[PDB]
Every structure is written in C-alpha cells, then in structure tokens.
C-alpha cells in the first residue's frame with residue numbers, strides 16, 4: 001500500500017545521519033521524489049570526470065570508491081561505503097564534474113537517487129546541514145590534494 005511504502009522509506013531515511021533531523025515535510029518531499037537504481041558487481045554508479053547532478057543514498061549492499069592519482073597507473077582504492085551512507089554531493093556543492101569512481105562491490109546493490117532541485121529544496125534548505133556539507137567537502141578537497149588526485 002501507498003502508506004506502507006512511504007513508512008518503509010521514512011523509517012530507512014531517518015536512519016541516515018544526514019537526514020536524521022530533517023523536518024517531516026522535507027523528508028516527505030524526498031520520499032515522493034526519490035528514484036531507485038539497482039547495480040550488479042562491477043558496475044560503475046559514478047565515473048570520475050563525467051557530469052553529474054544527482055545525490056545518492058546507498059540503500060543496500062556495498063560499493064568501493066576509487067580515484068586517479070599521480071604516480072599511479074590504476075585508480076587507487078580510497079574506501080568502501082555500506083548501507084545508510086551516501087555520495088555524489090561533492091559535484092553539487094563544488095559545481096564540478098564527478099571527482100571519483102563509485103563501483104558496485106556486490107550484486108543487487110541498490111541506491112536511492114535524488115535530483116539537484118530536490119536536494120536543494122530539502123537538505124540545502126537548512127543552514128545547519130548546508131554548513132555541515134560544505135565543511136565535509138572542504139575536508140575532501142584536502143584529502144584529494146594529499147593523495148595527489150588527478
């Protein structure tokens with residue numbers, strides 16, 4: 001049922017650090033506008049260098065994050081993300097192309113997809129979250145420069 005569906009998504013979204021304290025009305029907007037994408041082991045969810053305007057929330061499975069760096073021929077494995085975590089916000093906050101690869105590490109991986117407008121009208125609407133995200137993005141820029149990202 002419609003309401004049972006919204007409830008299952010609402011319960012899951014409340015468990016995401018970034019959305020935990022969001023007001024009910026904005027959480028409802030996320031629930032009405034989100035889309036679901038499934039991936040199999042090895043699939044690229046995001047490719048470094050491509051244009052991107054969507055924010056992702058890992059709803060099932062695990063993915064790996066890889067990045068091209070100076071001195072290396074193959075992208076370096078930066079970290080792994082699991083259910084409840086998110087990615088893709090950097091492109092929206094810096095207004096730039098994707099800065100790393102996100103690859104499905106398991107079969108039947110599932111991500112919740114949120115467009116730029118929705119992201120701006122919800123998360124970007126509260127100064128608390130905006131400030132948190134900017135600070136986090138600033139740290140990522142510093143990690144990139146440290147490992148000599150390409």
Ligand SMILES: Nc1nc2c(nc(Sc3ccc(Cl)cc3)n2[C@@H]2O[C@@H]3COP(=O)(O)O[C@H]3[C@H]2O)c(=O)[nH]1
Pocket residue numbers: 046052065078079081086087088089090091092097098099100101102136140141143144
């Ligand atoms: N440049 C860079 N990106 C990183 C790094 N670690 C991650 S996982 C992650 C996700 C969310 C938070 Cl708050 C913190 C870490 N990412 C994600 O990869 C995405 C590629 O696409 P994008 O749109 O550039 O967003 C990027 C980020 O979300 C990193 O050390 N350097």
Ligand SMILES: [Sr+2]
Pocket residue numbers: 096099
């Ligand atoms: Sr850049």
